[model samples]
Target: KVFGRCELAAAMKRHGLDNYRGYSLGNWVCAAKFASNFNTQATNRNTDGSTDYGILQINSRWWCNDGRTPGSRNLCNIPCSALLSSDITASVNCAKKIVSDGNGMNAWVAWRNRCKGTDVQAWIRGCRL
Candidate 1:
């Protein structure tokens, strides 16, 4: 579900992720833009055979299990399908867990490549938050 910039921003604010766990709202928005373009069902198979799921592109190996991905640690204890839905609460909770695990948004390569050290304000430009 490709979300509008303000829609994604609003969701992030409601999820209390606009600013928490040492990252800015813009950081999260920018990361989402590059990660999955705010599409909840977005999935990508990585070069290592691991797959990324949902808007934040949570990995299957260390986070959720899709059953086909062997040896998934399932650290988030949620089904991979749970990440691929319009209701992103589960994905958001899992992301909070990832942040708590100490990596923050750096857990996502998109964040490193696209959002990190960039002028991220435009990501949430028209949002009321």
Candidate 2:
């Protein structure tokens, strides 16, 4: 489908911000919304009155404390800045570093399989790398 740097790599990064990693375009969109709405930097209390900070909304301060970090606060990876620069290649690679750096080959394979009607999640389950 002539996937460009923006379509392939940027989408991967935007989606993997959450636990959502796969080749399905639908899953990617779903994950994007989840990261955007639930994942954001800054201090906010949860329903039980617990503070969640940083992208992925990592709470309890266990996962990461660098909410103030460049891309950590954004949707994951250096997104907001790269998006501003309109540098699709950098944004895509940056996201890859977060999503499936080791198993990206599998992810890519799954992406190709997606066209052949393969289950997207299975690719992430294993067979990566």
Candidate 3:
């Protein structure tokens, strides 16, 4: 379940992420590009023996309970497997929770390295969003 660039924008927009937390949809698009390239099932193993899951790569160590991460916070209070679902509802809401917790978009390191402090318009260039 990989979304194309414009498709990802539309999907994200429909989820009320257009201006979530004062971060533009384009910022999210840019961040998602680096995080998982719009792939729904994307996963990344962290150096800390935890894992990141799904489109935004929600973490097992702090965000979701994966039954494996040490000292799991499960801040989102959702199963990490939910983050891998193709529907993306869980992933989106969990991502919002991360932002609403005062972390902002900086909760995603990928966003900080690439999507932050940059021209994000290019990420949504022809999406007509």
Candidate 4:
């Protein structure tokens, strides 16, 4: 399912991403906005042929075993297809792992470019979060 903005915000907060890595709920929400526009089934292919899957855009090269990207670490230990699921448990957990791995949310290029140091309250406003 493509999530409504507030719907994703509520889920993120519930999953404890509100201040994960010192990034606010708004920050996380904005990242999702730009990453996949809340589309759980989104996919993006990089120049090197690595693919980003799902709303958080978890990469096939380092995070997921997509059976396509060569030399994948598959650190998430799950099929890339799982990241595209609307349930999002796997996606959020993998995203948490990415952020916890020293780089924070900057691992997502779109988020880094669009959400970093930017006010994201607009992404989560009126959600009653």
Instruction: Score each candidate by Cα lDDT.
Output: 0.88, 0.36, 0.89, 0.90
What's the TM-score of every candidate structure? 0.94, 0.29, 0.95, 0.97
What tens digits encode model 4's per-residue C-alpha lDDT throughout 22-128?
88899988988899999999999999989999999999999999898888898989999999998988999999889989887879898889988887887887997
* Tens digits of per-residue lDDT for model 3, 40-73: 8999999999999999998898889989888989
- Predict model 1's lDDT versus the native: 0.88
Clashing pairs in 2: none
**Model 1 lDDT at residue 111:** 92
In the range 6-123, model 2's lDDT, one tens digit per residue, is 3433445454532445444444423323333312233455564334432222333222233343333333433232332322344334444445645542333223343234343432
Top of the candidates by lDDT: 4
Candidate 3, residue 75: CA error in Å? Answer: 1.5
Higher-scoring candidate on lDDT, 3 or 4: 4
List ranges where model 2 is wrong by over 4 Å: 1-22, 37-80, 83-90, 102-129
Task: Tell me the lDDT of model 3 at 70.
Answer: 83
Model 4, residue 69: what's the lDDT? 88
| Candidates in descending TM-score order | 4, 3, 1, 2
Error of 1 at 73 (Å): 0.8
Q: List the residue pairs that clash in candidate 1.
A: none
Cα lDDT over the full model 3: 0.89
